[PDB]
DNA sequence: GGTTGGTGTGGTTGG
């Protein structure tokens, strides 16, 4: 289903203040 | 949750808040993993060196939640629990090996902008996610300090899954590979944690192969809230996934 | 206030 997919961010694709800092750590 | 910040609306809709009937109090966070299904920590539920051991109807769970006391009139959904679950092999007695609890809820919850399920890791996505130096999330409503305090919004913090020596080496309790630990080392020269209050609350990673977000861990135990050289404790979701997936499929 | 603060031509939502 659209488990783990966010309506007010991922589905309208939109980041959330913070989440880039998780994106980075997997560098 | 110790030096997070607010989150914004909606930034963790697969939150719950675990809430006492009578006297009416806020126990714990909680995740919500389908329309039916909520996860939570064990001891939440039964801990009896504190003389805690709630049923069904002690119990509610409120979902699409933002602000920590206020009843969110139109946004917030309140369920009632059918049947609560604790993994059988769960050790209050010792470390909390298997700090984990699964509440049926009584009624579907319907799904909205506030209200949505966070995914369950398969194999590959743990094996791949859940590596020392990556960064998860933990959110809760609880204590903002060590006390030895409450928010008004829900708190969201980031942390580094730590290395499983430092974690052993952090504390004198056993730890099991029913666990992981999550924070940053003295010297980082960032800070946070979860704190008393948090338990249950989901620890979640955002997939950068398919963009959802995937609950690895529940807040479990800590000596402290933010110490140097302490680190939070968190249930490993995938190692008890075959209990969380017995249970479902048999009820 | 209220299943609920402190302010809303609401807000993450009426009157
Ligand atoms: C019930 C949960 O809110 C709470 C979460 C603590 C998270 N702490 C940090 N720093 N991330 N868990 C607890 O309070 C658990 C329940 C029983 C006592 N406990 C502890 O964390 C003790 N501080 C340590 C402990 C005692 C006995 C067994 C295992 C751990
Ligand atoms: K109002
Ligand atoms: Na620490």
Redesign the pocket.
Same mark, same amino acid.
């Given at each position: 289903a659209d488990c783990g997919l966010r309506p007010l961010f991922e589905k309208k694709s939109l980041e959330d203040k913070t989440e880039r800092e998780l994106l980075e750590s997997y560098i | 949750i110790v030096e997070g910040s607010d989150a914004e @609306?909606?930034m963790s809709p697969w939150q719950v808040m675990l809430f006492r009937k009578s006297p009416?109090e806020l126990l714990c966070g909680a995740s919500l993993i389908s329309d039916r299904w909520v996860l939570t920590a064990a001891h939440c539920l039964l801990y009896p060196p504190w003389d805690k051991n709630f049923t069904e109807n002690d119990l509610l769970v409120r979902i699409?939640?933002?602000?920590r006391?206020?009843?969110?009139?139109? @946004?917030?959904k309140?369920s009632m629990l059918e049947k609560i679950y604790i993994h059988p092999r769960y050790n209050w007695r010792e470390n909390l090996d298997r700090d984990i609890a699964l509440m049926k809820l009584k009624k579907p919850v319907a799904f909205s902008?506030?209200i949505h399920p966070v995914c369950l890791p398969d194999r590959e996505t743990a094996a791949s996610l859940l590596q020392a130096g990556y960064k998860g999330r933990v959110t809760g409503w609880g204590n903002l300090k060590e006390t030895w305090g409450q928010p008004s919004?829900l708190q969201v913090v980031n942390l580094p899954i730590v290395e499983r020596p430092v974690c052993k080496d952090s504390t004198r309790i056993r730890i099991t590979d029913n666990m992981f630990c999550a924070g940053y080392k003295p010297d980082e020269g960032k800070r946070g944690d979860a704190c008393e209050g948090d338990s249950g609350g989901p620890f979640v990673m955002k997939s950068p192969f398919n963009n959802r977000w995937y609950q690895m861990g529940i807040v479990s135990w800590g000596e402290g809230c933010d110490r140097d050289g302490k680190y939070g404790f968190y249930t490993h979701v995938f190692r008890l996934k075959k209990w969380i997936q017995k249970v479902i499929d048999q009820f």
């Open positions: - | @609306i909606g009416q699409g939640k933002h602000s006391t206020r009843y969110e009139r139109n @946004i917030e309140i902008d506030y919004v």
